[PDB]
Design a binder for this molecule. Structure first.
Ligand SMILES: Nc1ncnc2c1ncn2[C@@H]1O[C@H](COP(=O)(O)OP(=O)(O)OP(=O)(O)O)[C@@H](O)[C@H]1O
Ligand SMILES: Nc1ncnc2c1ncn2[C@@H]1O[C@H](COP(=O)(O)OP(=O)(O)O)[C@@H](O)[C@H]1O
Ligand SMILES: [Mg+2]
Ligand SMILES: [Mg+2]
Lengths: 471, 56, 476, 470, 119, 118, 119
């Protein structure tokens, strides 16, 4: 019969023995449904995903929930297919978990709705679409130095407490009302409070009505944090490949996905790699990130926040994710502490993607002049630390004078930061951004106190703010 | 000129005091980072050694 | 027996029981139709590496011998395609139609099977062709910093080979597949696709294919090299192949070494890169030059794998982001970059004009550093500083704008013979633009002489032409 | 008798022997196999016995690729270690690790004298213990690192600093003069470089007194382990039987230890510090102690040694240091400044400078050069901020000469013409010591510092300044 | 921080592969499980509450270490106390620059809100 | 402990180099084959130190107070042995060669102790 | 340090657990056993003595290796020679500030002990 029994339990990993010739495939889902037939047991409703063929009719599997209360010898059922989740117009306005079960309390999904398997190969070489158009966001530093590509991948790197979540919510506010197509949010390994808070902001928005959700947060065991991303991706893929829509895809932390992978690779019996990560880190990152692409049928724009474990950018997970992204913004605790938000480090910016076409005449000259000035200031900062500005050359003093202005004008007031500070936020167009930085680079405002440049929108607000300050 | 010479020696005195204080602070933070690097290096090497022995 | 049964499957690996006559490094095929390669012949089991999707392979499945050492198709039909590391097309244009194969593991030419590198490979980039020249049969590493042009250098080099009778093989290792398609559409437009053949191992592929890709590319290249053609192979993200090999070894339970890499990690790339060579006249005179590409995080040269590759190749070109943001494009660092054949890979005119340029420029960078502190200077040192600034200006170039070697030599002749000493530094770029236009209009005999004899034209005529242009030139 | 193959894991092969006649350690084994059908390949492979296991089994290290081997293949015990030809027959030829000529000039006859590769080192009573100086014609060396006739010379340096160019210049300057035999061993470095050196030797004519052995980067680790011992055996024959003076050039003896560490894990050892084999010092001393001069002859050994990341505390360089009579340590900072050959003038201990010989004239000049360059290092961090004004009076007299001494220590090499656009120069020690004494006396403080770069004699500096327009 | 050291000791005795600073890969989950269990319940669930104040000891004021960054990425803000400030006589030594409450502002009483801005 | 618990009195315990105690513990852990912790120390560093130090206390019938000499492995006070030891100190006392040369004995300058105990 | 390396090689070949740099757990005890045999015997034991001078070569000034630290902790003092002093003309090149002897004073004659302090 197509049923097995538990042989071993080691945290998230379970070993199941089947009959000869009835072994399940490598990604099959398995079910344990146990009624507590005696007061020294508890009842169980657990689902497993197969991972390895161990030899001797035994399979090693990963549990999607807690394994507390499992007993050697329980009966295990093979579903014959990978984890399958509902898709279609039925998912709009709903909140789900890793298994595709709604958790919003609006009722179940019909048993006969269409549901698609979570695992599948990526689109073929001949199906991909390769066209670059800029995605205006309204943030000065991005739209000048790190501009996002419609249909591509975006990476927000940052340490702990630096601004990834606020930046992603300002992007959701600036883009998702206007976007017109479908959208998907996937919360992997982040706060459950933040999932509740986001659901109510969205609800009021009726942006919930199109956009809503899947969640697996830091409370979940590693099995669910390893697969919620694939669930959300499946729901996005249906809209891309079945209706031709342009789809937004937000992922609140994609580093927690590889962290979850490394938390089970050890118990699966695999030798540790550098820094203790799993030996398959790059393969599992690639198999997931290759399915977030744009074909001819539709497009996916994905924005992914990426945690760097300590303030260390050479850590294997961030370093390996760097190869998949069409734009990157790196946030720095140094700027966040100097008071500069969004706190983006302007150099890294995938300044490659920016450069060639769109910006390439007008905006490219301004963007390169900004980066050249901030590079020279960064060269001087070492000697500025010991002796101050008293020993610089008079032409190297002008560099400091204007780099301070440029560095402060790159910061902005966000709509979502109003709830921290009574100041309302601002949306700034690319033309105005280019305009303002051009005048500052020419010297039109070299007399204003540097404080007038902090947390404003257009360059005119700097003038009005200095006038208010009394200059 | 007597005023100017007095002011020059006071100015150089204040500048070299501030420069020495800044250098001392830099030394302190650099020693902190050096010790962190030293500890991390030792841990990485010992982990590699024991992991190789375990795999063997 | 010549069959076996799978006893373990997972993570792109499998163990088999039986296969008594299997060879080390053989091809095996599963019941699924998927291929594999026998790496470890244990006493009672065989460690296999799966060359395809493994989710269809179950314990108890049968595995068959094929009797063929690991192989790859080769032939004139691969030209103009996009092909998987096994020679299966992915571009969607039908079967490739080859007629023979080569081993992916083969012996590199011996000490006596070679000839000294003596003939140039033009990249069209002034800084490269003048400071760190690359010859046919050479191996040069291009190591950049993500935002600097490192990736475009080799695609520009391949497109610049359009009239030189080269054959090209772009090898994309662990790359994102929409970037490989973007490269293929770039080459297509160039009709450079029509020579370029293209091997792809995108990041969604299993580790074994990413480990095989460069060997397939080089094996497809040497088919033409041993027939007497001249080949250019570009390796992309050759550190991703090292990551794939580390994955494979750890999954087969070979103990790790430095970091978690195996002890064989140097020998991997050594085998790969030692196959590039210039064959001797007795062997047909063919050639194969390799251009590995590495991308660095925050410009760290001290990475393990990049240092191994530096130790394997004939020189490295280094592009730094601080140089890139300060206005030096391409951001080539002259003190850090070398060629180990240099000079023998330059035409006679280039040797005459730019034989000391790299050492001069490094000494100039050292003097520029020392002079900021130095409260005094004299005439000779000031003259050196001025010439260095003009050299830095002359070596600047735009992306995708190749320059013929004959024009490069004439501009560098002007620089090194003191003809730019009176021009302001901020005017040198425009001087060069207008000098090229003037040469087009008036110095066709000079250009033709350089082009047909590989040597400098008459010195007096050259000086006369330069001085006439100087008369026509207007300073800002 | 006959054995069978049992396991194949890359370079390491397990063989089982039947009747209790196990091969001894270091014995060579042969696998010669003609294909039985179209599903096989022909094999001709050599293995070296490394360990004895239980159950009549041996671990061996392959000397070539292991592709094609099948479990069950027959293995022949040759009864002895790898043996290679010795004598006049080796002069002018090129060999591989097994003693097979790889040049196209024929094959060695079957009956010729053929010596084994493994051998105990000479004893304490038979060692030569006198120091004669060797003139190289290179200013920095002959002043600040003199080589010993019959001693050991090590050239340390990280990747791309000039070890091979310097080795080739040393061959160019010494081998033609030498009245003996020369031996070269390429161990894990570039086949292109090997082909270059062979053709240069041919054109010069020195190849008629020279034996060359190559195992390059493309070889499996067994060949890279044993090629140095092949070359050593060929040199030992000439030292012992003919009483000749021998020059032994080894290019990157670091690859010998690196190959050992490549095979160690497959052999089954536990890793040592920094991932090396536990037997690193023992294995290195085995080879190093055989390279020495005795009462019957002398071996002057010059080795290039790779420092993995310019980190001189790495165990391989750290252990090599205890075997060398003199060293030269090459510096990346000089290489980047364009100062070639780029020898670091301190690290060399100048050891031969061991006061007596140089002691009157040369030792005072050499120590005054090192004192001036030591002070300039200390000044360089002060120099930047405070120092260029404050130093400008007292210490600028030191800096002005240290800049010029450091530019004059560079030189133009004969074999570096493709890099310099110039022909090379050869400077005798008298002229070197004279020139540096002049610069220290201040006879040339007025000439521009750039005139001192990449010249030979000090008269050449004067001429170059004249040409510059001084 | 002491709980994390204890758990690391337990894991090394079970021979689980260590990672950064020799901590197991599960160390983030160790504290995420615990700190995710404090919450403000909705009116359907009774309206109760549970608020946690975890303490972490740094070594030299270093906030970028592994464990401190883990907990910062788990909680809703941090109160940073400075040793030099404690030694100067300011014993309730709250470094106002580095310390922040990400959800607490909406829970101040209006009287306090009306005077805290100028302070 | 005998004199604290039986004779009911206040005792003094001097330990010359607690660092050598922790170092011996690390050597024993390596001998028994346990997996090393950070910076090479035994995984049980804190437990072993705590088991030693928690037996020095004041009871209802007496007390033990301990003067302990502590070696900082590289003048790094964040190193695990100094950190785990400093986690238990109630006081400190530093001696100055400057005062010993000025002739001021005992030669004491004991600042951290002021803050907790006093 | 070379004796220590030889012992480490033997103990790894016999498959014993590795320590800080693959050294076994008894590497400190090896050198303690060795160096504590150098003693000054009491008169009832004959009055003989045995003094040891271990010598170590550095690679730049670094004494932070494991074996040098062990021996430094075991001995009674160390004499430091630096290449910076050696090239600046100070030979024998002893760094009197960093060097130490813990017997010092007791190991000098009266005439020396009279005049060395002012020096
Ligand atoms: N642009 C901004 N303007 C004002 N305050 C900001 C801004 N960005 C961040 N902050 C403040 O700094 C903190 C940053 O928190 P945020 O959730 O954005 O960080 P994070 O990187 O997502 O962190 P975590 O990894 O802990 O989830 C918040 O408490 C917020 O008050
Ligand atoms: N004496 C020299 N003169 C000019 N250039 C040199 C000299 N020595 C080294 N170089 C430069 O350094 C490069 C690398 O030197 P190489 O001999 O390969 O050193 P290594 O063997 O240490 O890598 C050479 O290709 C050359 O460009
Ligand atoms: Mg967040
Ligand atoms: Mg070399």
């Amino acid at each position: 019969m197509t049923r097995g029994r538990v042989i071993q339990v080691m945290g998230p990993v379970v070993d199941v023995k089947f009959e000869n010739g009835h072994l399940p495939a490598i990604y099959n889902a398995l079910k344990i449904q146990h009624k507590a037939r005696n007061e020294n047991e508890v009842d169980i409703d657990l689902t497993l995903e197969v991972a390895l063929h161990l030899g001797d009719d035994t399979v090693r599997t990963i549990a999607m929930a807690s394994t507390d209360g499992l007993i050697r010898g329980m009966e295990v059922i093979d579903t014959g297919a990978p984890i399958s989740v509902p898709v279609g117009e039925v998912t709009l306005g709903r909140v789900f978990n890793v298994l595709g079960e709604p958790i919003d309390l609006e009722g179940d999904i019909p048993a006969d709705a269409r549901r698609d398997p979570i695992h599948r190969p990526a689109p073929k070489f001949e199906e991909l679409a390769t066209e670059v158009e800029i995605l205006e966001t309204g943030i000065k530093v991005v739209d000048l130095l790190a501009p996002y590509i419609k249909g591509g991948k975006i990476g927000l790197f940052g340490g702990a407490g630096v601004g990834k979540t606020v930046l992603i919510q300002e992007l959701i506010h600036n883009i998702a009302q206007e976007h017109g197509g479908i959208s998907v949010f996937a919360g992997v390994g982040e706060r459950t409070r933040e999932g509740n808070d986001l659901y109510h902001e969205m609800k009021d928005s009726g942006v919930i009505s199109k956009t809503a959700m899947v969640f697996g947060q830091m409370n979940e065991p590693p099995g669910a944090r390893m697969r919620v991303a694939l669930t959300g991706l499946t729901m996005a893929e249906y809209f891309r490949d079945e209706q031709g829509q342009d789809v937004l895809l937000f992922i609140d932390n994609i580093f927690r996905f590889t962290q979850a992978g490394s938390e089970v690779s050890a118990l699966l019996g695999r030798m540790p790699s550098a820094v203790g990560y799993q030996p398959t880190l790059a393969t599992e990152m690639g198999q997931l990130q290759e399915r977030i692409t744009s074909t001819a049928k539709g497009s996916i724009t994905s924005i992914q926040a990426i945690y760097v474990p300590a303030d260390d950018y050479t850590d294997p997970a961030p370093a390996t994710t760097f190869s998949h992204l069409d734009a990157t913004t790196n946030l720095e605790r140094k700027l966040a502490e100097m008071g500069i938000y969004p706190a983006v480090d302007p150099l890294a910016s995938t300044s490659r993607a920016l450069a060639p076409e769109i910006v390439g005449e007008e905006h490219y000259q301004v963007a390169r002049k900004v980066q050249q000035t901030l590079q020279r200031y960064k060269e001087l900062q070492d000697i500025i630390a010991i002796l101050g500005m008293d020993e610089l050359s008079d032409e190297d003093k002008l560099v400091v004078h204007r780099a301070r202005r440029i560095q402060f004008f790159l910061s902005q007031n966000f709509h979502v930061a109003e709830q921290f500070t009574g100041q309302p936020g601002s949306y700034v167009p690319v033309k105005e951004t280019v305009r303002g930085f051009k005048e500052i680079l020419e010297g039109k405002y070299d007399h204003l106190p540097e404080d007038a440049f902090r947390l404003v929108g257009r360059i005119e607000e700097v003038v009005e703010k200095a006038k208010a300050m009394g200059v | 000129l007597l005023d100017a010479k007095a002011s020059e020696h006071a100015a150089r005195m204040t500048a070299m005091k501030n420069a020495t204080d800044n250098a001392n602070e830099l030394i302190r933070t650099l020693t902190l980072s050096y010790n962190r690097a030293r500890q991390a290096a030792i841990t990485q090497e010992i982990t590699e050694i024991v992991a190789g022995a375990n795999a063997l | 027996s010549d069959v076996g049964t799978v006893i373990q499957v997972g993570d792109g690996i499998a163990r088999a029981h039986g296969l008594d006559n299997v060879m080390s490094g053989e091809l095996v095929e599963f019941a699924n139709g998927v291929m594999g390669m026998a790496l470890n012949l244990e006493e009672n089991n065989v460690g296999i590496v799966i060359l395809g999707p493994y989710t269809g392979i179950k314990e108890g499945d049968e595995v068959r011998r094929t009797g063929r050492i690991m192989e790859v198709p080769v032939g004139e039909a691969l030209i103009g395609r996009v092909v998987n590391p096994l020679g299966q097309p992915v571009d969607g244009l039908g079967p490739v139609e080859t007629t023979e194969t080569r081993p992916i593991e083969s012996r590199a030419p011996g000490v006596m099977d070679r000839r000294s590198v003596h003939e140039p490979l033009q990249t069209g980039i002034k800084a490269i062709d003048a400071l760190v020249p690359i010859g046919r049969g050479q191996r040069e590493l291009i190591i950049g910093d993500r935002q600097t042009g490192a990736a475009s250098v080799a695609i520009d080099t391949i497109i610049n080979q359009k009239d030189q009778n080269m054959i090209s093989i772009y090898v994309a290792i662990g790359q994102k597949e929409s970037t490989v398609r973007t490269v293929v559409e770039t080459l297509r437009k160039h009709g450079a696709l029509d020579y370029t053949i293209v091997v792809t191992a995108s990041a969604s592929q299993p580790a074994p294919l990413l480990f095989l890709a460069p060997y397939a590319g080089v094996a497809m290249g040497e088919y033409f090299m041993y027939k007497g053609k001249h080949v250019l192979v570009v390796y992309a993200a050759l550190s991703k192949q090292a990551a794939a090999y580390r994955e494979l070894s750890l999954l087969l339970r070979r103990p790790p070494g430095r970091e978690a890499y195996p002890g064989d990690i140097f020998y991997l790339h050594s085998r790969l890169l030692e196959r590039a060579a210039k064959l001797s006249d007795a062997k047909g005179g063919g050639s194969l030059t390799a251009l590995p590409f590495v991308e660095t995080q925050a410009g760290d040269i001290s990475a393990y794998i990049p240092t191994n590759v530096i130790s394997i190749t004939d020189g490295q070109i280094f592009l730094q982001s601080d140089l890139f943001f300060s206005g030096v494009r391409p951001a080539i660092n002259a003190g850090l970059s070398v060629s180990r054949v240099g000079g023998a890979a330059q035409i006679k005119a280039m040797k005459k004009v730019a034989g000391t340029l790299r050492l001069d420029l490094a000494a100039y960078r050292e003097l520029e550093a020392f002079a900021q502190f130095g409260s005094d200077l004299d005439k000779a040192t000031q003259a050196k500083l001025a010439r260095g600034a003009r050299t830095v200006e002359v070596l600047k170039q735009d992306l995708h704008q190749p320059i013929p070697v004959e024009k490069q030599v004439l501009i560098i002749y002007a620089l090194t013979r003191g003809f730019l000493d009176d021009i302001p530094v901020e005017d040198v770029r425009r001087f060069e633009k207008e000098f090229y236009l003037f040469l087009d209009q008036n110095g066709q005999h000079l250009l033709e002489h350089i082009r047909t004899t590989k040597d400098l034209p008459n010195e007096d005529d050259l000086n006369k032409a330069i001085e006439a242009f100087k008369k026509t030139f207007v300073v800002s």
